Amino acid sequence: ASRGVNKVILVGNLGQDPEVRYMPNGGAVANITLATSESWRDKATGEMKEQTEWHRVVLFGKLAEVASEYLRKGSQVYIEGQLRTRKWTDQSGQDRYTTEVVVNVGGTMQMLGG
Amino acid sequence: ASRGVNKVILVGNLGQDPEVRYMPNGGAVANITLATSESWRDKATGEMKEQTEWHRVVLFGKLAEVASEYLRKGSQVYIEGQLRTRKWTDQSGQDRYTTEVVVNVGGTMQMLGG
Amino acid sequence: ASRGVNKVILVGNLGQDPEVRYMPNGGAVANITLATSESWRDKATGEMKEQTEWHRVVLFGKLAEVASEYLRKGSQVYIEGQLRTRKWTDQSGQDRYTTEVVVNVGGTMQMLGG
Amino acid sequence: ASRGVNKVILVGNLGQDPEVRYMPNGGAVANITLATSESWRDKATGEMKEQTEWHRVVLFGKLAEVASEYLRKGSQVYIEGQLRTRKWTDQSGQDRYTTEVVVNVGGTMQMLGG
């Protein structure tokens, strides 16, 4: 009615080991970078094309901890979270924006290995 | 699986009328802005709290045409798209990145309500 | 690989007034029925075909209480839940299965009008 | 908006081999069964409880042909479809309903892991 719905679903692999950070000012946070791709074989070129998107995902608390422990580069994972654009001034005085996929509360992540 | 899943689902209100453009031998394109919110009936100083996110949605083809003809500020809509981050040069000629929800052949847009 | 993912996302209208019930536990349950539709076009159906699915949705606790008080025949509503097939024996005393969209602690229900 | 949204996202493992069947009139249709589970060590005792849901997933055309060749018992897949409840009278004159996850034109299936 005014709240609305803000839902991201991803399945993809980590392009790097997770970077995890503890804080007795909150507890864990983990940043992960996920790739999702799209493959082609275009008529012009003759040979294969491809286009990969990198997604910045931030996990918190128990999930961040889980991430530090199990998730490594190349790992396949499922994520339900939400979009968050945050503002920051960089060192040369410029206002900048980073939109991230944040998994909290009623988001999820799951590992599609074994 | 290299490929993966890249899906965004939004339900929210347009913050402005749709901003519509044709193109080279143009197909239609339309940039819209969707608000989604999260209350927080907190302590604070006496009352609740609020954070809204604005999402940058881009529509192509018939949907772009449709949005221009029948969508206005405050319309409630459901959107299914995918995340895309594009790079672009700014007024000073440094890099700037924008992540947006692109609604494509695969996506959907529906007007909600009563 | 166990657990997996079990997610239903619905937007539609109540076919009926919500039926609310309290279980001996103490806590509410609401059974609602939600209509979604898809429209057609065809050839020796120069007419338009419409198929509507009725989904059986069950809500527990506070979300059931909310439903009773606020939701009505016609209300449009957004639901995240999971699929449950329950088994039940009928008057002749034989086995029958019903698959329902259960909205739990994992899921959500949101009123899309006011 | 009558119409609305009817979406199922599943990630799970095939409980058995794909049952595929061709039509000399409308190509392949494949039936697969997918498990999703939920574990909790709870409560009275301290012992491990499981509950698994089985989903009847129907694939059409090219996804069905793909399923035939590559999908086996235990394969892990991601599915995006819609719910369908169909009616049928069984042989002892009684009305029955089966609810199924249908993967159409707007859905997808992706094979996961490795």
- Please give the structure tokens belonging to residue D34: 């997918």
Q: Distance, in angstroms, between B94 CA and closest chain C CA?
A: 41
Asked if B114 reaches chain C (Cβ–Cβ under 8 Å), the answer is yes
D53 alpha carbon, distance to own chain's centre: 11
CB-based contacts of C76, cutoff 8 Å, min separation 6: B112, B113, B114, C11, C12, C13, C111, C112, C113, D1, D4
B8 alpha carbon, distance to own chain's centre: 10
CB spacing of C37 vs D85 below 8 angstroms: no
CB spacing of D11 vs A114 below 8 angstroms: no
Query: CA A5, CA A110: separation in Å to the nearest integer?
Result: 21
CB-based contacts of A35, cutoff 8 Å, min separation 6: A12, A13, A14, A15, A52, A53, A54, A55, B4
Query: CA B23, CA D50: separation in Å to the nearest integer?
Result: 56
Asked if B105 reaches chain A (Cβ–Cβ under 8 Å), the answer is no
Q: Distance, in angstroms, between D58 CA and closest chain C CA?
A: 16
Q: Distance, in angstroms, between B54 CA and closest chain A CA?
A: 8
The residue among D84, D70, D69, D67 whose CA lies nearest residue D33 is D67
Query: CA D53, CA C82: separation in Å to the nearest integer?
Result: 10
Query: CA C110, CA A1: separation in Å to the nearest integer?
Result: 8
Question: Measured over all CA atoms, what is the biggest interatomic distance in chain D, rounded to whole angstroms?
Answer: 57
Chain A, chain C: beta-carbon pairs less than 8 Å apart = 22
**Cα separation of the two ends of chain B:** 42
Cβ burial D44-69 (10 Å sphere, 16+ → b, else e):
eeeeeeeeebebbbbbbeebbbbbbe
CB atoms within 10 A of CB B100: 18
How many CA atoms, within 13 angstroms, populate the side-chain half-sphere of residue C48?
A: 4
Query: CA C89, CA D34: separation in Å to the nearest integer?
Result: 25
The residue among B12, B26, B18, B27 whose CA lies nearest residue B76 is B12
Whether the CB-CB separation of D67 and D29 falls below 8 Å is answered with no
Whether the CB-CB separation of A71 and A14 falls below 8 Å is answered with yes
Strand partners, B86: B98
Alpha helices in D10-103 (DSSP H): 61-70
Residues of chain C contacting residue A106, judged by C-beta atoms under 8 Å apart: 106-108
Question: Where is B58: in which H helix or E strand?
Answer: strand B51-60
Asked if B98 reaches chain D (Cβ–Cβ under 8 Å), the answer is no
Which residue in chain C is spatially nearest to D36 when comparing CA positions?
C4
A101: exposed, middle or buried (Cβ count in 10 Å: 0-12, 13-18, 19+): buried
- Please give the structure tokens belonging to residue A106: 């009623």
- Minimal Cβ distance to A4: which of B1, B36, B82: B36
Strand partners, A55: A34
Q: At residue B44, what are phi and psi to the nearest 5 degrees?
A: 60, -120
Q: At residue B18, what are phi and psi to the nearest 5 degrees?
A: -70, 135
CB-based contacts of D76, cutoff 8 Å, min separation 6: A112, C1, C4, D11, D12, D13, D111, D112, D113
DSSP assignment letter at A70: H
Whether the CB-CB separation of B81 and B102 falls below 8 Å is answered with yes
- Minimal Cβ distance to D83: which of C35, C53, C85: C53
Residues of chain C contacting residue A108, judged by C-beta atoms under 8 Å apart: 5
Query: CA C10, CA C110: separation in Å to the nearest integer?
Result: 11
Neighbours of chain A (3+ CB pairs under 8 A): B, C, D
Q: Which of residues 17-76 of C touch A (CB under 8 A)?
A: none
D31: exposed, middle or buried (Cβ count in 10 Å: 0-12, 13-18, 19+): middle
Question: Measured over all CA atoms, what is the biggest interatomic distance in chain A, rounded to whole angstroms?
Answer: 56
Alpha helices in D49-94 (DSSP H): 61-70
- Please give the structure tokens belonging to residue B74: 């405050």
Query: CA B60, CA B102: separation in Å to the nearest integer?
Result: 8
Cβ burial B24-47 (10 Å sphere, 16+ → b, else e):
eeeebbbbbbbbbeeeeeeeeeee
Query: CA D14, CA C1: separation in Å to the nearest integer?
Result: 12
CB atoms within 10 A of CB A78: 21
> What's the alpha-carbon Rg for chain D, to the nearest Å?
17
Residues of chain D contacting residue A78, judged by C-beta atoms under 8 Å apart: 11, 78
| SS3 assignment, position D63 | helix
The residue among B36, D4, C3 whose CA lies nearest residue A8 is B36
The residue among D55, B5, C104, B74 whose CA lies nearest residue A79 is B5
Whether the CB-CB separation of D67 and D19 falls below 8 Å is answered with no
- Please give the structure tokens belonging to residue A24: 């007795």
Strand partners, D96: D88
CA A17, A23, A28, A30: dihedral to nearest 10 degrees? -30
Domain C1-114 has CATH 2.40.50.140: yes
CB spacing of D55 vs C12 below 8 angstroms: no
